[PDB]
Amino acid sequence: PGRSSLDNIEMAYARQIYIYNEKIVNGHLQPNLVDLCASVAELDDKSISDMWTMVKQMTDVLVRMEFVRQALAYLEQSYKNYTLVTVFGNLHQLGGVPGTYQLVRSFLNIKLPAPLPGLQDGEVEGHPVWALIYYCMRCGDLLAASQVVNRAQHQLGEFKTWFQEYMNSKDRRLSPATENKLRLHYRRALRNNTDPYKRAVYCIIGRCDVTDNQSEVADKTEDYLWLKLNQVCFDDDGTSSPQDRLTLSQFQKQLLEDYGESHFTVPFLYFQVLFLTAQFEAAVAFLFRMERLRCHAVHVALVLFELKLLLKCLRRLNFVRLLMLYTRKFESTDPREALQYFYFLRDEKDSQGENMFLRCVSELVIESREFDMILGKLENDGSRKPGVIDKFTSDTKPIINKVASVAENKGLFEEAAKLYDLAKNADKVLELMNKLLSPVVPQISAPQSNKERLKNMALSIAERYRAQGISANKFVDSTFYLLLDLITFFDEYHSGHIDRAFDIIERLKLVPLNQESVEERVAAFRNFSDEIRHNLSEVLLATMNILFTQFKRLKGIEDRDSQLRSQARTLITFAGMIPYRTSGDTNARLVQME
Amino acid sequence: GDSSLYIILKKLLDFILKTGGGFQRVRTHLYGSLLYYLQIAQRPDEPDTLEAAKKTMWERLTAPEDVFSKLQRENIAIIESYGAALMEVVCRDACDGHEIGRMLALALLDRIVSVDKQQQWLLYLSNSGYLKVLVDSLVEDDRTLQSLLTPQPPLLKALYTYESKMAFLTRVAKIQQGALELLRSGVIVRLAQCQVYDMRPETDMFIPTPVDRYRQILLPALQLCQVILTSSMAQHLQAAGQVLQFLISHSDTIQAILRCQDVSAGSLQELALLTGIISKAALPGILSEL
């Protein structure tokens, strides 16, 4: 296998967050949810998809943001949409005008109230009035339902009164007066008997009998939810001391008991019930299960998050951590993507979360060690070329110092140099740099291709910094140049060019070419910086080599062999004076003679 | 130089082999000292350092340094002798007593493990003992993660030990001979028996913690399986077939793992990578599912 399937999916999702981050940065109006809804259409997602539409309706669906009110609206609108669609398709085309009332009459008449019509409704002039009121109510068209009742020809008319004021108010029709009276009538007359829809209207409007369920006409799971939502009374529930209060909390618990995901079958639908019910945490957790698609749970959470929920990793709900853990999968492979996800953490605006974000990024940089990608790269003057994080911005200098110091512990030189460049500690960079180039200079030969490494690194920095307003110490730079000179000597040492090597070595002004001034070379030796003091071993012996090979005794006129001979002599006196302060290879002698 | 330390290392090996010490408590001390010594000798260095040293030896162009390699060789010789004897003692001991001293002995076994990887041990150890016991203990690992809640406490003991056991298993798998021994011990079978994989973790303490923990077990076991697979000849070899069966039988978990988030995500991400490595490493699980 291979499952390009997810990776493709991973990328598609990553793409969407990426665009979302671009919008936030660019102050755009990109909707997250529409974006998923578009993709989600394809399949299995037909659940996840409905979930997204639920969230989207919530877009700016605050509009204040009342839990049950919005859930009710979603269910009510969904039903309405369903109704409109049925009407919107042949018939008659319904005979009359497209009014909402007629659309519902159509649903009731054409849709499945009749296979070929009949049974136990109260009907006048071919129309079940109570069913109509119930469905209109279901649609959210309370006003119309009220009007139907008004016109009704009925004789429970006291109820008619109680419908109108239920409607007039916020729909929590609370008269300090009659509600009590309505309840008694329900129990005595209505409760043991009647037309199912009539009972529904009384029960639902009245909140008559808190033991809950409507016998005959609960036909759908959403019908089931809607009914329950209607029943709860949030406001001024605490006030009034009867225990006929039904709360969202109570509703939420019932959904938990057993009702269970299994019970909400279409398990498919359970997800939606959780969102509607306000069990966001549970909802993410539930999405957290099949394949939960950790990916899906993460993004949904992101969406709830945009909504400003999350108001206080299979089972770990906190947004920061949900995101962070998600990153664990891909972070090594796709550090850029990880950054994009971590960035969402800020979406929950407030301190704490902000630090969590910062810590997460800091944690990402450390141990991923993707410095160039994350932090930045190469100056060519022109400061840093921004890393992905920098595009996001801010605390970046302190992270660098932290990382760089750590590099120092590990001894990950190169990383340290890289980090310090970003730090813009120019002096520090060269000094670390001198050390790196300095060793690797002393050693044994056969190396140094002309294109890449510590030497090459050396060349980069010098060209780079020195011309430009150089902040480094003169001393530091000086050793730097010396190391470079010695290196060029290496390039030309071997690959022929014997003569050229002597010229350059002499230029170094380290080794006595002149007279017996070898000793002055002693006096100036101990003074030498640690980096050079180490390198001298090869300087000598390079000299006695070229000196040897060049001064190969020639065949058969001016031939001044004497020089390039005196040079060896002075050099040997030099080597003779400091052998103890040298590694211990006066095997200059072997090359010296023949 | 920790030469002076070397002598103590020898004494420690001597006592352990002797298995004198009514107290496992005593042996725990021996294990601890040995552990530090093994760790101390190789300050964290990785294959790069070894390669550099070899080149320098390259050959003794001039005067080379081969100090750390020489030190490791001396340690390994000492250890070998004493070794067969002591391996017996260390494993049996293991089990019991000391769930305590355990934290100490499993850590000692793992350090030792790198060094003396390769060699020696594989043969000795193999046989015995260990394998049989360790595979059976995989099964029981699943059961042990549940018992995990209870014992959170007795957890301290065992985290020091159970994690150490997984590590020991992973290390054996990294090499050819070790992987063979684990597989011979019937690794796939024990894993089937543990039933760690043949389930869904989400199904089911703060829930994100349990998911992190369960997924955590899954990542190490999955690494052990991937390592055993690759470490043989993953191709026509028998190993490839066994791993494929592993994937297909525990399919849909692999698929399910692919999407979501948290530290839990981090563990999930690692698990996902591990499956991917298993996939390509075998006959492409996809390739097989033509």
XYZ file of C-alpha atoms in Angstrom, chain A residues 4-5 31 111 117 123 153 158 165 221-222 231 287 300 304 395 404 415 555 573 593:
21
model
C -1.666 8.500 -1.137
C -5.270 8.928 -0.133
C -14.774 31.340 5.376
C -46.179 13.903 1.676
C -55.710 9.278 2.696
C -59.930 17.421 9.715
C -63.183 26.333 14.289
C -58.808 28.835 25.995
C -48.793 35.605 24.039
C -34.267 12.057 15.018
C -34.181 15.770 14.367
C -39.223 22.015 25.945
C -15.301 12.976 15.934
C -13.617 20.854 13.332
C -15.519 25.782 16.603
C 10.062 36.720 19.401
C 22.286 28.503 19.556
C 24.260 25.162 13.464
C 70.356 18.269 -14.610
C 66.499 25.894 13.417
C 67.476 14.851 3.556
